[PDB]
Structure 1
Amino acid sequence: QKTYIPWSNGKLVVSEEGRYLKHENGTPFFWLGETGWLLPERLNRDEAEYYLEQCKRRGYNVIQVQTLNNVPSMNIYGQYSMTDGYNFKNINQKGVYGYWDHMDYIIRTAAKKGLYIGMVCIWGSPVSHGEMNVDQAKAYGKFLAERYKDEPNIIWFIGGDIRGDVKTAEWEALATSIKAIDKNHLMTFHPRGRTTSATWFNNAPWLDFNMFQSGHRRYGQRFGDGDYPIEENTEEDNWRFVERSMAMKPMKPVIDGEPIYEEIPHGLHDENELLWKDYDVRRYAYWSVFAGSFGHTYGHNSIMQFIKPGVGGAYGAKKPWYDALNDPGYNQMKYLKNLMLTFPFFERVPDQSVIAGQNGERYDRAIATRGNDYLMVYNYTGRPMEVDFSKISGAKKNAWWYTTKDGKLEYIGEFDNGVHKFQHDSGYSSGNDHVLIVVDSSKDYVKKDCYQIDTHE
């Protein structure tokens, strides 16, 4: 059965409303990201093929990597990413399978499977430690853009766990050098924990969409005093990054490029802290999207560092990457993508006024989104809610429950056009999160006889 190739619909473009990505032919692109940070540095050819194929099988269509993690970077074969500093003229050597030949392979294997590579050009650490100045950045961006501009399946990531006000001149030079040559790919900036690219780069012409990092601290988790880029006790409210990014004008799309990671300890500093679980992963995913993000990126502690036996992880990871492929949150992100692709895509907005009466706080805060003829409410705890059906068209509505851990659908019934009270039959605050789906009765986006929403690719 012919593998879906996203870019058969054309190159990626910011849609006219300023909220979503599409292909040139009008087709929605629902970004479902996986975090393969150390893919170029730690996997060999067979391993990379296996990783990429296992990601495809689970609906991911963007794989975020660190193209470089040091200056120079090393790969599993013992090849340097630079053999003469930032002079790239003799980087290809006849009869040597180099760092960049393996990068090429990863990109082209991904292309065969219909996956984009989210290329973090160079992670923030070496840059803030002085290892790429302004001239080095121009020479590197030029090298990247000339090598990869005609590869169909690239999205460029400037930054890498770094604030936009650190080494700004170096990041601008990298970004502008790439954009002077490569007119075929989009670009973003991946920022520091608890920050959004919008703060520094919303108005930057090289930046097509914004990205934030909501990971990896719990409510109230401080490790001393500094200036703190968020209000106290809002760490887990990743919907706040969405509202703050999209309030900046002109409006551009936004995504959580690094939420919490599955099995990573709360806050990263203590190896023995509570681990983030599947239910947390889902919460961050639905909260970001229902707040207005154009898609979501997922990660897992073990997969992102490609943990193997003999190579202990940061953040107390022991489980190999290849066994983390069976963990639950990794296997549940497809149900989000399949959901969002089931309904009219470009007219979707966030709308908390869909939720009437008194709303909960923290985890009990129900979150809603709608088109013109459908609405969706994500309830994490199961706390009773009131939903105003008059915010969408239709004199009668149909309603369903969608459970997010398995994509199952349960038809509720027909309803007139007022406020209505809803409460899912499941354990309260038990990680049995659910979406209330409500559709104008005249439309047929979901049938009444469906047990589940099928795969949209």
Structure 2
Amino acid sequence: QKTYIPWSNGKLVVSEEGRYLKHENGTPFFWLGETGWLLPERLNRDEAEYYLEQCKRRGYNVIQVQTLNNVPSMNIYGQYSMTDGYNFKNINQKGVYGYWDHMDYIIRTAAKKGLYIGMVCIWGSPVSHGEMNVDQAKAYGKFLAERYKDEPNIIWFIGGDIRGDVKTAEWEALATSIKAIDKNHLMTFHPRGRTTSATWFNNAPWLDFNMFQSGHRRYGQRFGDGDYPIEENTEEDNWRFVERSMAMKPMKPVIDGEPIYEEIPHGLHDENELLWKDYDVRRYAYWSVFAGSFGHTYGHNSIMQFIKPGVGGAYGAKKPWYDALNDPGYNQMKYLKNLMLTFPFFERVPDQSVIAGQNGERYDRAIATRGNDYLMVYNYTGRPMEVDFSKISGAKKNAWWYTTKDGKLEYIGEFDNGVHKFQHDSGYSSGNDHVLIVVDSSKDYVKKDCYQIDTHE
């Protein structure tokens, strides 16, 4: 069967309401990102093709990569990303398969699979360490733009785990240089941990949507008493980055571009700390999206650095990337994509008023989002909750349970516009998170006899 190609619907555009991404033809684009930071540096042609195919089979449609991780960067073939500093005039050499020829291959192979490559032009580290000044940034942006403006499947990522107030002039030079030549792709900024791009670039004309990094500390995890970009004991409340970002006007879409990674240690520093699990990965995903994010990016400790036997990972990673493809979290993100694409997409808004009574704290905090004729409440712990059906249209409502770890759907019954109490038949606080789906009885986005939400290309 033919592979689904998102851009056959046209290029990506920020939707009119300023919350979501769409294709030119109005088709929704639910961003489901995978984190392949070291794809260009560590995988060969065969490995890259396999990685990309495997992500495709699991619903991912954006692959985030570090175009460059150093200056210069090296790939698996032993090729340099720069052979004459920031002079790219002679970067291409006849009869030589260079660093950028391999990048081209990665991008074109992704294209055949209907995948966008999220290009972090240059990771923050080398930049904060002075390896890219304002002139070098212009030279590099022009090179990237001229080379890739006509490739369909690109989304530009300025920054890379770095504050927007660090080497700002250099980042602005890069972003503007690319946008001056490339009018065909969207652009964002990947910020430092516990920060959002919105803080520095919400009104930047080159920034189409905002991005934050909620990974990878647990509640109350500090390694010092210095300045801290967030409030104490709110590390895992990634929905907070979403509110604060979208509160800055004019409003632009926002997404968690780097939540906690599956199997990565709480806080990164201690290889022997608890590891984030599939239930944690799902919580961050649904909390961000139900808070108002237009999609979500997932990450895995072993995959993002493409761990291989003979190369131990940072942060305690030992499992090879190709074995990590079988881990639960990585294989559950598709149920999120399938769910959001089952309902009216663009009129969706976050709305905690859908939750009546006293809502829980921390993991017990139910989170709600709704359209005009449907609503959803994500409950991570299973703590009983009261839901106000009058918040959406319809004299009668149909309700279902949706279990996020398997995408299964269970019909509950019909109700009136009162406030109703619900409690899922599962272990309390057991990582059996669920979504209460409530739909206007006149609409049929989900069937009563439907036992699972199917795959949505």
TM-score category by the smaller chain? over 0.9
Name the CA distance, whole Å, in 1 between partners of 2:26 and 2:413: 33
Q: Deviations 1:283-313 (Å, cap 9, x if unpaired)?
A: 0000000000000000000000000000000
How far is 1:124 from its partner?
A: 0.1
Name the CA distance, whole Å, in 2 between partners of 1:414 and 1:360: 26
Name the CA distance, whole Å, in 2 between partners of 1:119 and 1:358: 43
Name the CA distance, whole Å, in 2 between partners of 1:249 and 1:173: 24
How far is 1:3 from its partner?
A: 0.2
Q: Deviations 1:171-219 (Å, cap 9, x if unpaired)?
A: 0000000000000000000000000000000000000000000000000
Name the CA distance, whole Å, in 2 between partners of 1:328 and 1:13: 32
Name the CA distance, whole Å, in 1 between partners of 2:420 and 2:68: 53
Tell me the secondary structure at the aligned position of residue 315 of structure 2. Answer: helix
How far is 1:54 from its partner?
A: 0.1
Q: Deviations 1:405-425 (Å, cap 9, x if unpaired)?
A: 000000000101100000000
1:166 match: 166
2:296 match: 296
How far is 1:241 from its partner?
A: 0.1
Tell me the secondary structure at the aligned position of residue 34 of structure 1. Answer: strand
Tell me the secondary structure at the aligned position of residue 165 of structure 2. Answer: coil
Name the CA distance, whole Å, in 2 between partners of 1:155 and 1:417: 43
Q: Deviations 1:29-51 (Å, cap 9, x if unpaired)?
A: 00000000000000000000000
Name the CA distance, whole Å, in 2 between partners of 1:212 and 1:416: 39
Name the CA distance, whole Å, in 1 between partners of 2:200 and 2:81: 30
How far is 1:225 from its partner?
A: 1.6
How far is 1:247 from its partner?
A: 0.2
Name the CA distance, whole Å, in 2 between partners of 1:52 and 1:202: 32
Q: Deviations 1:343-382 (Å, cap 9, x if unpaired)?
A: 0000000000000000000000000000000000000000
Name the CA distance, whole Å, in 1 between partners of 2:430 and 2:442: 35
In angstroms, what is the RMSD of aligned CA positions? 0.2
Name the CA distance, whole Å, in 2 between partners of 1:367 and 1:224: 31
Name the CA distance, whole Å, in 2 between partners of 1:125 and 1:278: 29
Tell me the secondary structure at the aligned position of residue 203 of structure 1. Answer: coil
Tell me the secondary structure at the aligned position of residue 314 of structure 1. Answer: coil
Name the CA distance, whole Å, in 1 between partners of 2:300 and 2:456: 24
Tell me the secondary structure at the aligned position of residue 336 of structure 2. Answer: helix
Q: What is the correspondence of 1:97-136 to structure 2 with a 5 Å cutoff? A: 97-136=97-136
TM-score after normalising by structure 2: 1.00
How far is 1:226 from its partner?
A: 1.2
Report how many residues are paired: 457
Tell me the secondary structure at the aligned position of residue 315 of structure 1. Answer: coil
Name the CA distance, whole Å, in 2 between partners of 1:421 and 1:182: 52
TM-score after normalising by structure 1: 1.00
Q: Deviations 1:417-449 (Å, cap 9, x if unpaired)?
A: 100000000000000000000000000000001
> Is 1:267 the equivalent of 2:267?
yes
> Is 1:368 the equivalent of 2:368?
yes
Tell me the secondary structure at the aligned position of residue 421 of structure 1. Answer: strand
- Segments of structure 1 that go 5 or more residues without pairing to the other structure are none
1:283 match: 283
1:330 match: 330
> Is 1:191 the equivalent of 2:196?
no
Q: What is the correspondence of 1:299-310 to structure 2 with a 5 Å cutoff? A: 299-310=299-310
Name the CA distance, whole Å, in 2 between partners of 1:226 and 1:46: 46
How far is 1:143 from its partner?
A: 0.2
Q: Deviations 1:248-305 (Å, cap 9, x if unpaired)?
A: 0000000000000000000000000000000000000000000000000000000000
How far is 1:112 from its partner?
A: 0.1
Name the CA distance, whole Å, in 2 between partners of 1:369 and 1:442: 20
Name the CA distance, whole Å, in 1 between partners of 2:81 and 2:414: 61
Name the CA distance, whole Å, in 1 between partners of 2:454 and 2:146: 40
Name the CA distance, whole Å, in 2 between partners of 1:375 and 1:94: 58
Tell me the secondary structure at the aligned position of residue 196 of structure 2. Answer: coil
Name the CA distance, whole Å, in 1 between partners of 2:123 and 2:102: 19
Name the CA distance, whole Å, in 1 between partners of 2:34 and 2:114: 14
How far is 1:21 from its partner?
A: 0.2
How far is 1:105 from its partner?
A: 0.1
Tell me the secondary structure at the aligned position of residue 231 of structure 1. Answer: coil
